[PDB]
Amino acid sequence: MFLYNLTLQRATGISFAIHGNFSGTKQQEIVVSRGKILELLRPDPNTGKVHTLLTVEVFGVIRSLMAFRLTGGTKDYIVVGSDSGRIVILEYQPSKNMFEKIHQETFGKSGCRRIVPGQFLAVDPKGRAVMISAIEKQKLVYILNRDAAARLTISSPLEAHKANTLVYHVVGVDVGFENPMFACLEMDYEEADNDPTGEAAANTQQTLTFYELDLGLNHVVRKYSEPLEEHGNFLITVPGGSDGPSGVLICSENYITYKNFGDQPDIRCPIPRRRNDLDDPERGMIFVCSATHKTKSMFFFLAQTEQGDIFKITLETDEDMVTEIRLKYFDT
Amino acid sequence: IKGGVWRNTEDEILKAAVMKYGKNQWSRIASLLHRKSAKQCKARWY
Amino acid sequence: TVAELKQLVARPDVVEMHDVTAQDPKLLVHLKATRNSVPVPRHWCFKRKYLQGKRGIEKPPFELPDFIKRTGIQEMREQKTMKSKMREKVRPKMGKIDIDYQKLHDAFFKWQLTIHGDLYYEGKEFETRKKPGDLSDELRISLGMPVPPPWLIAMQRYGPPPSYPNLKIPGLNSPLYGDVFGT
Amino acid sequence: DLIFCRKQAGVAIGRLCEKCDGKCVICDSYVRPCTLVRICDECNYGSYQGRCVICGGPGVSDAYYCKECTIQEKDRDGCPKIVNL
Amino acid sequence: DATVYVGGLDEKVSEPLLWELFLQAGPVVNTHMPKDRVTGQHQGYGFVEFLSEEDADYAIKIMNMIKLYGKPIRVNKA
Amino acid sequence: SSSESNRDRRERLRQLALPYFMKNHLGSYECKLCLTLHNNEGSYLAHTQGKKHQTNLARRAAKEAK
Amino acid sequence: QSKYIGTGHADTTKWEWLVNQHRDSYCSYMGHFDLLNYFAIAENESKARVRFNLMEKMLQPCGPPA
Amino acid sequence: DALMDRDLVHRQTASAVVQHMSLGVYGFGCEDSLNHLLNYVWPNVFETSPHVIQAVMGALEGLRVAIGPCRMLQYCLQGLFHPARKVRDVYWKIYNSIYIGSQDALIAHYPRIYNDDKNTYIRYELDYIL
Amino acid sequence: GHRVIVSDVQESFIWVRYKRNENQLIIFADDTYPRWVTTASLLDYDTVAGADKFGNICVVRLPPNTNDEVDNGASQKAEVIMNYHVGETVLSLQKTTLIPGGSESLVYTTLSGGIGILVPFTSHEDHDFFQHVEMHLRSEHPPLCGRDHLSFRSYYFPVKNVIDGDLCEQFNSMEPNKQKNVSEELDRTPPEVSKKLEDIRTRYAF
RNA sequence: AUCGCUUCUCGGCCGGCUAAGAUCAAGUGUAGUAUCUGUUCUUAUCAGUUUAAUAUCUGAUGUCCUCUCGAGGAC
Ligand SMILES: [Zn+2]
Ligand SMILES: [Zn+2]
Ligand SMILES: [Zn+2]
Ligand SMILES: [Zn+2]
Numbered sequence A: 001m002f003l004y005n006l007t008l009q010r011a012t013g014i015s016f017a018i019h020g021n022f023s024g025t026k027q028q029e030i031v032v033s034r035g036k037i038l039e040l041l042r043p044d045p046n047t048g049k050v051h052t053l054l055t056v057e058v059f060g061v062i063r064s065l066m067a068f069r070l071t072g073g074t075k076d077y078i079v080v081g082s083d084s085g086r087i088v089i090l091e092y093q094p095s096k097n098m099f100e101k102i103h104q105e106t107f108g109k110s111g112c113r114r115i116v117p118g119q120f121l122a123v124d125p126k127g128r129a130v131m132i133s134a135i136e137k138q139k140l141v142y143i144l145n146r147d148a149a150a151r152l153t154i155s156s157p158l159e160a161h162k163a164n165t166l167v168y169h170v171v172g173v174d175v176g177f178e179n180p181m182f183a184c185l186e187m188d189y190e191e192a193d194n195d196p197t198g199e200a201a202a203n204t205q206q207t208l209t210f211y212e213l214d215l216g217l218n219h220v221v222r223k224y225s226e227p228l229e230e231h232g233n234f235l236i237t238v239p240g241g242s243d244g245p246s247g248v249l250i251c252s253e254n255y256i257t258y259k260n261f262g263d264q265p266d267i268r269c270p271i272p273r274r275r276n277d278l279d280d281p282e283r284g285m286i287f288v289c290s291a292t293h294k295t296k297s298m299f300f301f302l303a304q305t306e307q308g309d310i311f312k313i314t315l316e317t318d319e320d321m322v323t324e325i326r327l328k329y330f331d332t
Numbered sequence B: 001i002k003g004g005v006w007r008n009t010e011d012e013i014l015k016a017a018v019m020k021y022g023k024n025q026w027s028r029i030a031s032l033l034h035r036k037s038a039k040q041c042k043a044r045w046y
Numbered sequence C: 001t002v003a004e005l006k007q008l009v010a011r012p013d014v015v016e017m018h019d020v021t022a023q024d025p026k027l028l029v030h031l032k033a034t035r036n037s038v039p040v041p042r043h044w045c046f047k048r049k050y051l052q053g054k055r056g057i058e059k060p061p062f063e064l065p066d067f068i069k070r071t072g073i074q075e076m077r078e079q080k081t082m083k084s085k086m087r088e089k090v091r092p093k094m095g096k097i098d099i100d101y102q103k104l105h106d107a108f109f110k111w112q113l114t115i116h117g118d119l120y121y122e123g124k125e126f127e128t129r130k131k132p133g134d135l136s137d138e139l140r141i142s143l144g145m146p147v148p149p150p151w152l153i154a155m156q157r158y159g160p161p162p163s164y165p166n167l168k169i170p171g172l173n174s175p176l177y178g179d180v181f182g183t
Numbered sequence D: 001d002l003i004f005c006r007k008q009a010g011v012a013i014g015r016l017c018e019k020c021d022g023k024c025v026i027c028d029s030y031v032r033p034c035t036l037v038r039i040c041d042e043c044n045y046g047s048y049q050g051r052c053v054i055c056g057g058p059g060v061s062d063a064y065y066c067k068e069c070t071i072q073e074k075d076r077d078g079c080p081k082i083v084n085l
Numbered sequence E: 001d002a003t004v005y006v007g008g009l010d011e012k013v014s015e016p017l018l019w020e021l022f023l024q025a026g027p028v029v030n031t032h033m034p035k036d037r038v039t040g041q042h043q044g045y046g047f048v049e050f051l052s053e054e055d056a057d058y059a060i061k062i063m064n065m066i067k068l069y070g071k072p073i074r075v076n077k078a
Numbered sequence F: 001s002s003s004e005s006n007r008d009r010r011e012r013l014r015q016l017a018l019p020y021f022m023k024n025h026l027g028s029y030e031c032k033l034c035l036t037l038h039n040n041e042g043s044y045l046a047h048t049q050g051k052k053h054q055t056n057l058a059r060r061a062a063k064e065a066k
Numbered sequence G: 001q002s003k004y005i006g007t008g009h010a011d012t013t014k015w016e017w018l019v020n021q022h023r024d025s026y027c028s029y030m031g032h033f034d035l036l037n038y039f040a041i042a043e044n045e046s047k048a049r050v051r052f053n054l055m056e057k058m059l060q061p062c063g064p065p066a
Numbered sequence H: 001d002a003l004m005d006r007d008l009v010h011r012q013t014a015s016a017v018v019q020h021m022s023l024g025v026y027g028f029g030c031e032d033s034l035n036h037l038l039n040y041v042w043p044n045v046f047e048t049s050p051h052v053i054q055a056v057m058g059a060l061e062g063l064r065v066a067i068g069p070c071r072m073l074q075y076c077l078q079g080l081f082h083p084a085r086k087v088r089d090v091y092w093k094i095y096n097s098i099y100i101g102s103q104d105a106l107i108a109h110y111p112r113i114y115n116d117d118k119n120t121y122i123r124y125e126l127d128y129i130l
Numbered sequence I: 001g002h003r004v005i006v007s008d009v010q011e012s013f014i015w016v017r018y019k020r021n022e023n024q025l026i027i028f029a030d031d032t033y034p035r036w037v038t039t040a041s042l043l044d045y046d047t048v049a050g051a052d053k054f055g056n057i058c059v060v061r062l063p064p065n066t067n068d069e070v071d072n073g074a075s076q077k078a079e080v081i082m083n084y085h086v087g088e089t090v091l092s093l094q095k096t097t098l099i100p101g102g103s104e105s106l107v108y109t110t111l112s113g114g115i116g117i118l119v120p121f122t123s124h125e126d127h128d129f130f131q132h133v134e135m136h137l138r139s140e141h142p143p144l145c146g147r148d149h150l151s152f153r154s155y156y157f158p159v160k161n162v163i164d165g166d167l168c169e170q171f172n173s174m175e176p177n178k179q180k181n182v183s184e185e186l187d188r189t190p191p192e193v194s195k196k197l198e199d200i201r202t203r204y205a206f
Numbered sequence J: 001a002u003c004g005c006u007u008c009u010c011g012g013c014c015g016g017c018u019a020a021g022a023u024c025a026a027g028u029g030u031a032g033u034a035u036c037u038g039u040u041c042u043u044a045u046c047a048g049u050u051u052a053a054u055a056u057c058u059g060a061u062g063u064c065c066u067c068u069c070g071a072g073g074a075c
Helices: B008-021 B026-032 B038-045 C025-032 C082-090 C107-111 C137-143 E015-023 E053-063 F002-016 F041-048 F051-065 G014-031 G033-042 G047-057 H008-024 H031-045 H050-067 H069-076 H085-100 I124-140 I149-153 I165-172 I176-185 I190-204
Strands: A003-009 A014-020 A029-034 A037-042 A051-057 A062-069 A076-082 A086-093 A098-106 A120-123 A129-133 A139-146 A152-157 A165-172 A181-188 A207-214 A219-227 A232-238 A247-252 A255-259 A267-270 A299-303 A310-318 A321-331 D002-004 D082-084 E004-006 E030-032 E046-049 F021-023 F029-031 F036-038 I004-007 I013-018 I025-030 I037-041 I047-052 I056-061 I080-085 I093-096 I105-109 I115-120 I162-164
Touching: A003 I080, A003 I165, A003 I190, A014 A062, A014 A076, A029 A062, A051 A098, A062 A120, A076 A120, A098 A152, A129 A165, A139 A207, A165 A232, A181 A232, A232 A255, A232 G047, A255 A321, A267 A321, B008 B026, B008 B038, B008 F002, B008 F041, B026 B038, B026 F002, C137 E015, E004 E053, E015 E030, E015 E046, F002 F041, F021 F041, F029 F041, F036 F041, F041 F051, G014 G033, G014 G047, G033 G047, H008 H031, H008 H050, H031 H050, H031 H069, H050 H069, H050 H085, H069 H085, I004 I037, I037 I093, I047 I093, I080 I149, I080 I162, I115 I190, I124 I149, I124 I162, I124 I165, I124 I176, I124 I190, I149 I162, I162 I165, I165 I190, I176 I190
Parallel strands: A003 I162, A120 A165
Antiparallel strands: A003 I115, A014 A029, A029 A037, A037 A051, A062 A076, A076 A086, A086 A098, A120 A129, A129 A139, A139 A152, A165 A181, A181 A207, A207 A219, A232 A247, A247 A255, A255 A267, A299 A310, A310 A321, D002 D082, E004 E046, E030 E046, F021 F029, F029 F036, I004 I013, I013 I025, I037 I047, I047 I056, I056 I080, I093 I105, I105 I115
């Protein structure tokens, strides 16, 4: 017997969303990722009716997705974190109404792995170097520079390898025209495996480390480390240089902490709770995801709880020194 | 180069060959063995 | 203790002589009995290096699948003096096989083992798959019975055999088609 | 005495000389050239520009992997430029 | 009783149809059915060693029902 | 090819001079007493022409005659 | 092989083998969007909190060693 | 007939045949007979001869991709913890060969292993039922 | 109405016939593989379809020689006739005829929100043709991420007897030189090819 | 009819001469395996190493006293 397969209704589930300018237009095309599917939408400034410009199936499990831009560049490419051992850089040709495969690079084995990258994906604000990472042991970097014709060329990889180290999340860091930085959440289980008592199960804090790419030395050295008080799930870029301070926000259990280097001391704030809540007090809270709103005038952040509570995160700074943090209830 | 130590295999095969062909034909017997000549086969017999 | 270790398993029969020396028997007991997994081959603890040529000298050289036999190549392949060989170079004749390209475009299309629960080991060939209740053709011929084999009439009177106690043979406690009169 | 270097695979294309020209590196075979070889500039640099991946002569061509090593995914490991020990 | 003596056979019978033949009753552990070398043919009498004795005494009871080539087969203890 | 003739000629010579030696389902020569395998029958024959092969036939000789 | 995590050997313990297959299962859960969503459905949480609890269970699972 | 051993070279070369066949036929649905042949392949696992052991390795690798890991692993389970050192050396070598590739797809096929005192060996995630 | 199909959470299918007089529950067959089972469906009396918690679809058929009354860990089993990885977990399986006047087909939803169908072939011609489709398409039009199609559909279990329609339909999106040149490798025309794939969809579904 | 001898008959085992006519083919090296032959452990006990278990390897021959390995006494 033989069976021919047909899809009829394509999956409506949306795992990821990235907003960039893919046509070189002042409008913002929204590239969203259905489960096995790559998808491209066009919302309308006036009526807001969301036009689907493209829907394509990649025949592979999408893992993470990020959009980026060359420095001061006109247009935006796409980086596809995949389940294969290949990162691919894509460009949507507005005319042809379909994507082209701009770059195909093979960093390792196939399928969702423990040590194989593609899991977590970060990129520099200036688009110099994109950093790709697995859950454990392997963190790789591809450096990007436009060619003589200003068409994108990808470099050779690098290696961040650190033994027996779990990576919670990786977020690009803002340093304008500098040696790029990266915020890697890490933890070491090597303390836990050699501790028959079970003490290392507790009393082990996830280490926040900033790697520094260095163009001139063309390797990636561990530079910054601080132990995190409590375990946060994810991090947030804080645009630095001209606009705002350069630092990272850390979303932690029942807290958010701006935690940065230089002389900058950490700033913690509790995650506010609603008056007269019916839930188990034993159930804490963190934030799910965050979408930064970046404006030539100002900037802020948007956070959400399990319960769906979006807050507007703000920074109170003295010059480049942030003194405190202000969170106003935004919506739900 | 052909010269060397005598082997039980070469020696037994020499027995059988001498039995079959006869004493006066040496070139025929040297033909079967490897790494040995007719003179060497004859003098090895006698 | 190899004794009490046999009380902790659904199929303790899996535990064997050297099994009690295992570095982790308290698991291997639970693995070896896993549902569809297959046993380890037995040729070790036998020092014979997995084979000898005793039973292997009575085997046929080979026999073709019937699909290849009907073709007719078998008769085509079957002798030559040396000067005929240097004549075979100077003379040479062509087209000795002269196969039918229709036939060899036919057989393997138009015309043309074991399950997972089995694995081969050294000496095993015929036996497991002649048993009480299962005999060969010819010996049927010497016996000369038309389609029970008649001494399973006396397996009525004298009783079920001590040697194969689990026995069932047709018509008695085993309620039979072709050759096989007992299982 | 002779074994892979296995440094991280870069974007540099492999280069085989006259001798090694047709060989798929790992399977040692000439069959079904399909994909392409990548080795790090740490293995391929300078006097190694256009050098053979094996003997150390000038590369006249580029190595192609077989289909055999493709499905077994061996082409994705460290750079298969043999180093003498 | 572990062994039995078996008379009155035809040489087309061999050690195999004895193997198969008496294991129909109960397994023959050790088979002995002489091959005569001189004229290369069998006289047709057999000796059988079993696992233990019970096999072979049941074998005395049941055993002499076999008929090899239309003809009678002797089985007795030994 | 001349090499091919020797293989043929050294099998026949070890067939003439030859009851124990045989050829298995493969091509090798074997001594069925001693259960030895021989690269060439003549090489095998010598083992067949040896004093150890001799003994193990006598020992099996006695072992049967008992 | 050694530098490839999950490599086994003859001296491999139970505990290490099972904690391996655990951690690999968890990386699969982080990997496949759906199966993750199944988990979120069954036991009611966010996708986030699920992945968080898993990342907590990465080092521990089965608890202390022996 | 060949894999059943007259002499080692038969097992070796025949095994190589099983390899290239196994890569070639992949995905077309013939796996059954390849399983049957895998039966006769399987005893040859044990030997010290370099060419036959590396041959058998290539063999079982191709058979890995063609048959799928599940069946492989179902032949490779019991050998892991067996008391002897030999069997563990080898079955762990095999299990590694099966492990590096397709490590992603192995998850489903690890059997149920009961939990002892200090450790919980049951993965309960798979037992969540809607 | 005759037999009963047990679905294990782990060891998958257990064929169980209920003897009415003895009232006994009878396991006469089981699967050759462990599979984590979401739900089952009957294509017919002798076949069973099943989905994996991991998002696989298997179909296992009894041998026609099965013993209907009986009394390592089993006696006789059933061969696995199909393995296909959807990549999306399937919580229900239902066989039906989607459209009036259409051909009977198999139906699977998934957890991702997608709804799709499996369809039998009525001819070896469309069979082999779609085979060449899949073949020259794959290498000539690789998947987007660089991930291979074949492996992705063979992901947990190797593909057996399934042609992927969503790859065959991408014939539309290829460049006209791809479309044409491939059609030549297929010895057809873009209209021929295209309509011939519209055949199955049309006839069976929308 | 028997013995011996003989004759016939039947059955079974059951390559010419010459100057011998003249003349006479071997690659290498790096790794590695297999198959032949020859030769060695009647060691007793215990302890340790070691092995799946063997095997193997590694160490010594109830204690004290007296007399000339043996004898006696005390345990
Ligand atoms: Zn290198
Ligand atoms: Zn070269
Ligand atoms: Zn290759
Ligand atoms: Zn011998």
